């Protein structure tokens, strides 16, 4: 086509989606990770995670307001990944890298799994 | 903070949101523009437009499944702007620029209004 493109548009959209999440506006699901609860937008979760994409395209699970994750999932690892979904920024630290990588593998977030593997390999 | 950032994350999210729109997955509103209907996600509309942000934060309008736009709004101008919301690409042409600018002014999409004004000024 002969379209023009606004470079900062995708980033501005994600910033506003994160502002809606922070104010709990039009969030339609709560993700339960052991004792912890995280409110989010199903569309953003699907757009970032192969696991959520599979869950919310399922004809019965698409209508659930609560999703319980596997008990082995660490709430902090989930929190860090949820923040990454809504910001593009990943808070990867020596103290959380193992939990973040395991959570990213479960959530099917291949770019996160890739950077965790590289950061671990460099420390070996 | 000490975060790392994935450059293509915002663009990848928007691409997936557009794929969900194309397959009519988790769309929660229909925008009526005279004889034409457009299905979309309320969160994306709010993230892109000052008008939709005001409508869907309203305690009664947030629950509507149908929104009717002003009869002066051109369906093609709306279609072009809806495509821009979901892709960052604006199909701006001599034959549609007036309708696109008027629709962007109504929808409160200031970056679109700005490029339309500049493109019009250059042709004068």
């Amino acid at each position: 086509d002969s379209c023009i493109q606004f470079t900062r548009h995708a980033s501005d959209v994600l910033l506003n989606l994160n502002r809606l999440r922070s104010r709990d506006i039009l969030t339609d699901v709560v993700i339960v990770v052991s004792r912890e609860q995280f409110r989010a937008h199903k569309t953003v979760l699907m757009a970032c995670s192969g696991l959520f994409y599979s869950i919310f395209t399922d004809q019965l699970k698409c209508n659930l307001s609560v999703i319980n994750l596997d008990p082995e999932i660490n709430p902090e690892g989930f929190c860090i990944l949820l923040d990454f979904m809504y910001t593009s920024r990943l808070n990867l630290r020596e103290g959380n890298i193992m939990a973040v990588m395991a959570t990213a593998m479960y959530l099917q977030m291949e770019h996160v799994v890739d950077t965790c593997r590289k950061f671990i390999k460099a420390s070996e | 903070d000490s975060c790392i950032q994935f450059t293509r994350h915002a663009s990848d999210v928007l691409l997936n949101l557009n794929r969900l729109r194309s397959r009519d997955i988790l769309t929660d509103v229909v925008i009526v523009v005279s004889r034409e209907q457009f299905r979309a996600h309320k969160t994306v509309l709010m993230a892109c437009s000052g008008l939709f942000y005001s409508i869907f934060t309203d305690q009664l309008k947030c629950n509507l499944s149908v929104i009717n736009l002003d009869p002066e709004i051109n369906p093609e101008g709306f279609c072009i702007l809806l495509d821009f919301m979901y892709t960052s690409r604006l199909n701006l042409r001599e034959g549609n620029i007036m309708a696109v600018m008027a629709t962007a002014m109504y929808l409160q999409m200031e970056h679109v209004v700005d490029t339309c004004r500049k493109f019009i000024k250059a042709s004068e």
Binding site: C3, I4, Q5, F6, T7 | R89, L90, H111, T115
Partner: peptide, 4 residues
Amino acid sequence: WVIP
């Protein structure tokens, strides 16, 4: 704005 750019030419993509």
